[PDB]
Amino acid sequence: SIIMFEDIFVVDKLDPDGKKFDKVTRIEATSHNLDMFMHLDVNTEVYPMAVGDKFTLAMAPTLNLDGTPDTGYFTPGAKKTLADKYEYVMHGKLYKITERDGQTPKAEMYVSFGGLLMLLRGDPAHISHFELDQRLFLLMRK
Amino acid sequence: MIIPVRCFTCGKVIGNKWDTYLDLLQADYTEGDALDAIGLVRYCCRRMLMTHVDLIEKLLNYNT
Amino acid sequence: GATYQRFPKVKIRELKDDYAKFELRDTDVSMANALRRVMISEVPTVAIDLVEIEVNSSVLNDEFIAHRLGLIPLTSERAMSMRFSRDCDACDGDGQCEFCSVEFRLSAKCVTDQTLDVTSKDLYSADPTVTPVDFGDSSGADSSEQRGIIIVKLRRGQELKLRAIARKGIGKDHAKWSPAATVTFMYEPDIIINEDMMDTLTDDEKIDLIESSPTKVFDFDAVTRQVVVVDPEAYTYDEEVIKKAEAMGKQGLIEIRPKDDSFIFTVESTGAVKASQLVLNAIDLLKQKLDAVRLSDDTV
Amino acid sequence: GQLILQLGLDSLLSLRVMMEQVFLDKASAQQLAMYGSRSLPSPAVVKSSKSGPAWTFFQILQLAFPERLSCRGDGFIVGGSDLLSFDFGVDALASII
Amino acid sequence: VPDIVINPHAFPSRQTPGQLLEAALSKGIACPMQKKKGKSDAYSKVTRHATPFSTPSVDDITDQLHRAGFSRSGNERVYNGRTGEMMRSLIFMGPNFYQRLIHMS
Amino acid sequence: YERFVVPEGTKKVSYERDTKIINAASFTIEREDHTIGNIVRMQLHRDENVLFAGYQLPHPLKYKIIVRIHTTSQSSPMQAYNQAINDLDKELDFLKSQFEAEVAKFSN
Amino acid sequence: ANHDHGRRVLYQSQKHCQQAIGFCSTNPNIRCDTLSQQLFYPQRPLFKTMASECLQKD
Numbered sequence: 001s002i003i004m005f006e007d008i009f010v011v012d013k014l015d016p017d018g019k020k021f022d023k024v025t026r027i028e029a030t031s032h033n034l035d036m037f038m039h040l041d042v043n044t045e046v047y048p049m050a051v052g053d054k055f056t057l058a059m060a061p062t063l064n065l066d067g068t069p070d071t072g073y074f075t076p077g078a079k080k081t082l083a084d085k086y087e088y089v090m091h092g093k094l095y096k097i098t099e100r101d102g103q104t105p106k107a108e109m110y111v112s113f114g115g116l117l118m119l120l121r122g123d124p125a126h127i128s129h130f131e132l133d134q135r136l137f138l139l140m141r142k
Numbered sequence: 143m144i145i146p147v148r149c150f151t152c153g154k155v156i157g158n159k160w161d162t163y164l165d166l167l168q169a170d171y172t173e174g175d176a177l178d179a180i181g182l183v184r185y186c187c188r189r190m191l192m193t194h195v196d197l198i199e200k201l202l203n204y205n206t
Numbered sequence: 207g208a209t210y211q212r213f214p215k216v217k218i219r220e221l222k223d224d225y226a227k228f229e230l231r232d233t234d235v236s237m238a239n240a241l242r243r244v245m246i247s248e249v250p251t252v253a254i255d256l257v258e259i260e261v262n263s264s265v266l267n268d269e270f271i272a273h274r275l276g277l278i279p280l281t282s283e284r285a286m287s288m289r290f291s292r293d294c295d296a297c298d299g300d301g302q303c304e305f306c307s308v309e310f311r312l313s314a315k316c317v318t319d320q321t322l323d324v325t326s327k328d329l330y331s332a333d334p335t336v337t338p339v340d341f342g343d344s345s346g347a348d349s350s351e352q353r354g355i356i357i358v359k360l361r362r363g364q365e366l367k368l369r370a371i372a373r374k375g376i377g378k379d380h381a382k383w384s385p386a387a388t389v390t391f392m393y394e395p396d397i398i399i400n401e402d403m404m405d406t407l408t409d410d411e412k413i414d415l416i417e418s419s420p421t422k423v424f425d426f427d428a429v430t431r432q433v434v435v436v437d438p439e440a441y442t443y444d445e446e447v448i449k450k451a452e453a454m455g456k457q458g459l460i461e462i463r464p465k466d467d468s469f470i471f472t473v474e475s476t477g478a479v480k481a482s483q484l485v486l487n488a489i490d491l492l493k494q495k496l497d498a499v500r501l502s503d504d505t506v
Numbered sequence: 507g508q509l510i511l512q513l514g515l516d517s518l519l520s521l522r523v524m525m526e527q528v529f530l531d532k533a534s535a536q537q538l539a540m541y542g543s544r545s546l547p548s549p550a551v552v553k554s555s556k557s558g559p560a561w562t563f564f565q566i567l568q569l570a571f572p573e574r575l576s577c578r579g580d581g582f583i584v585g586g587s588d589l590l591s592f593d594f595g596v597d598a599l600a601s602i603i
Numbered sequence: 604v605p606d607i608v609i610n611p612h613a614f615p616s617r618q619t620p621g622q623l624l625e626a627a628l629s630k631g632i633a634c635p636m637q638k639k640k641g642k643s644d645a646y647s648k649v650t651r652h653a654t655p656f657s658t659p660s661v662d663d664i665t666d667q668l669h670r671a672g673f674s675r676s677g678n679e680r681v682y683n684g685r686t687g688e689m690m691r692s693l694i695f696m697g698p699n700f701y702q703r704l705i706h707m708s
Numbered sequence: 709y710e711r712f713v714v715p716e717g718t719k720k721v722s723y724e725r726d727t728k729i730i731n732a733a734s735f736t737i738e739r740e741d742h743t744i745g746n747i748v749r750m751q752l753h754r755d756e757n758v759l760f761a762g763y764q765l766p767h768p769l770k771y772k773i774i775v776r777i778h779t780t781s782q783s784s785p786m787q788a789y790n791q792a793i794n795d796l797d798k799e800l801d802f803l804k805s806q807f808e809a810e811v812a813k814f815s816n
Numbered sequence: 817a818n819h820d821h822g823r824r825v826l827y828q829s830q831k832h833c834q835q836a837i838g839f840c841s842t843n844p845n846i847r848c849d850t851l852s853q854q855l856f857y858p859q860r861p862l863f864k865t866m867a868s869e870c871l872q873k874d
């Protein structure tokens with residue numbers, strides 16, 4: 001069970017400030033059971049999402065489910081048992097963390113999926129993560 | 143001067159089709175019917191026959 | 207050493223002496239493009255490559271006549287077994303040989319007052335019956351004119367004596383050796399026209415958006431009020447039909463998708479080589495090129 | 507006081523059409539990877555339901571970089587020879603480059 | 604195959620739409636004309652006159668290209684000569700009278 | 709003339725083992741173009757244990773190909789390269805067989 | 817010709833038409849001058865203009 005974070009989220013506002021591209025939108029999500037704020041840039045060709053849907057999100061630091069921390073890259077392989085239980089996965093890099101959060105709200109976690117961005121807002125039970133070190137995989141289901 | 147062999151774009155041999163072209167235009171045909179009679183489907187050869195300037199005769203008259 | 211091998215299929219629609227069409231499928235685009243490029247530029251042919259003019263007294267010039275002689279197609283069926291003249295041990299005498307260097311002859315003169323024209327059928331070839339000038343554009347086909355390719359026209363005091371030497375070459379050296387004169391292919395479309403959107407819109411709109419097609423792809427079946435694809439292979443990928451469907455706002459009406467396989471060729475020929483002989487020489491030269499690039503000698 | 511070398515006619519058009527097509531396939535990506543340097547990064551979208559992997563074009567832009575670049579910009583953020591974020595603005599594209 | 608290929612950055616600045624109109628006119632001349640069986644000789648309503656101050660309209664040229672079988676916008680779909688697959692952008696083709704100038708180098 | 713097949717003093721194919729990455733080589737093929745490089749790379753992409761298949765021409769005027777193969781373990785560049793060439797040769801065999809069959813249905 | 821900018825038509829009708837390589841003469845055995853030039857296969861255009869049709873000079 002090599003998972004740093006795992007929760008379920010609901011979408012409430014597509015197109016927050018401007019629809020910058022034909023196929024890339026920013027998606028606002030709001031959590032449950034951990035209560036958090038959640039923004040994400042998603043490809044809306046291979047996986048579009050309507051408003052008022054549900055999806056469970058994970059964060060594995062390495063995709064093959066045996067604690068072997070190699071990058072792998074062999075994801076369409078025949079069967080070596082990776083974490084392809086879920087449906088939408090995209091590798092990325094965390095580049096600025098703000099778990100210092102020296103005011104009233106919670107932490108700020110900014111990652112970059114090579115040009116797609118994610119905003120996860122929450123301090124409690126998120127203190128596993130680091131500043132650099134591109135290992136996040138962002139599995140999405142439902 | 144004379145008609146060029148090998149239509150410049152594609153490469154079909156057209157170097158023999160000149161006199162039958164003149165005879166088909168001589169009979170009563172228009173140019174579209176004549177080129178469809180000789181069998182030139184793509185326009186790279188049709189532009190090579192319709193725009194040929196035949197200057198060999200003016201050269202033959204002015205020699206001696 | 208696994209399988210890693212896809213299995214092509216050929217099915218021929220038409221085949222004449224200088225024409226073909228076959229529905230090659232289950233192979234990738236790059237293989238079809240390789241066949242096209244080999245047939246245009248790699249397959250060899252015999253053509254005139256050297257000219258000695260003894261007398262020229264016409265109104266044309268020497269390079270004009272030599273340039274017209276270079277383009278006259280010669281029948282090349284022993285050219286796959288001939289050799290490049292840089293690779294011949296013999297024949298260093300600027301003359302006739304038996305594995306390259308066929309020699310031609312030409313002489314003509316007019317003594318009447320009737321404007322004699324010198325055609326391709328005045329070229330007489332030594333080493334006969336193997337590389338003559340081509341006659342299929344004159345006889346064996348009632349296409350245009352049996353007089354053949356005109357070279358010069360002459361008057362009384364005018365003559366032309368020369369001797370040409372044909373050799374072997376390929377289309378990358380000059381355009382005179384390329385035997386193709388048309389080699390092309392195309393995809394073939396997958397058209398998945400909806401019937402639950404087509405019964406919505408009205409009959410005048412039906413006969414309008416059928417009319418917007420520049421080639422007769424669809425047909426209007428008036429007896430059942432419906433439409434019908436009658437010829438997919440005349441679709442030319444210009445999207446005008448689906449664009450007028452977009453302007454009429456009826457989305458999901460028709461969709462058109464090029465299939466990954468199924469490459470309909472169309473091969474023509476100058477008449478130097480037959481069509482099926484061009485395809486088979488292309489496959490053989492691809493095998494020779496794939497043979498000459500192996501590193502099988504040192505495995506590690 | 508500026509650079510005497512800026513991107514000209516066809517190159518800027520190539521960048522515009524590469525921006526409006528944000529995703530690339532595998533084969534075009536590995537074909538473009540032959541040119542610059544830095545072999546190739548891992549794909550952005552590593553799988554989906556329908557296609558295989560998919561790259562973004564910012565990862566394609568990384569291949570021309572030198573080694574261990576770290577600079578801060580108006581829209582560009584570069585940490586360790588990677589292009590982390592890049593602003594939307596196509597109007598200011600001859601400036602962010 | 605084309606005989607001369609030029610850059611599309613030359614046209615929106617120098618303000619010569621006459622070259623595009625000339626290419627479309629000549630391409631509509633030299634092509635054949637389908638549906639010729641019955642109802643017409645099918646080669647008589649063909650415009651060949653690009654007289655300067657009295658010129659054919661856009662609708663004449665585009666409806667002629669529709670009659671000849673090609674696309675009304677002037678473009679034409681091509682395949683690449685290297686990869687061999689479909690080039691995504693439709694290409695504008697057609698004949699044009701070019702010239703060769705002295706003082707070669 | 710000299711533009712065609714490689715003269716004496718130069719191999720047709722020149723191998724080079726890449727230094728900085730394991731399972732990596734660069735095949736510098738003389739006297740070719742897009743015809744062979746394209747079919748080689750698209751045959752390589754149908755393999756299992758391959759990772760990176762491309763070709764590029766170091767100048768578009770000069771008549772040579774450089775091919776690069778990154779693979780996994782359980783294989784090498786040499787194995788998948790010769791696998792590609794031999795399977796393309798087998799497909800040209802099967803294609804020539806199909807075409808010479810289909811010529812016979814124009815029975816004379 | 818009324819579609820182009822006026823500068824382009826000035827170019828074509830004063831300099832480029834006067835320089836293009838094409839026909840030279842129909843008796844080249846007598847013109848002994850410096851740098852006579854000529855094409856091989858001259859042509860006429862696919863279109864027609866009024867003046868080129870009334871003049872009938874190709």
Ligand SMILES: [Zn+2]
Pocket residue numbers: 151152153154184186187387388
């Ligand atoms: Zn043609």
Ligand SMILES: [Zn+2]
Pocket residue numbers: 294295296297298303304305306307
């Ligand atoms: Zn010899």
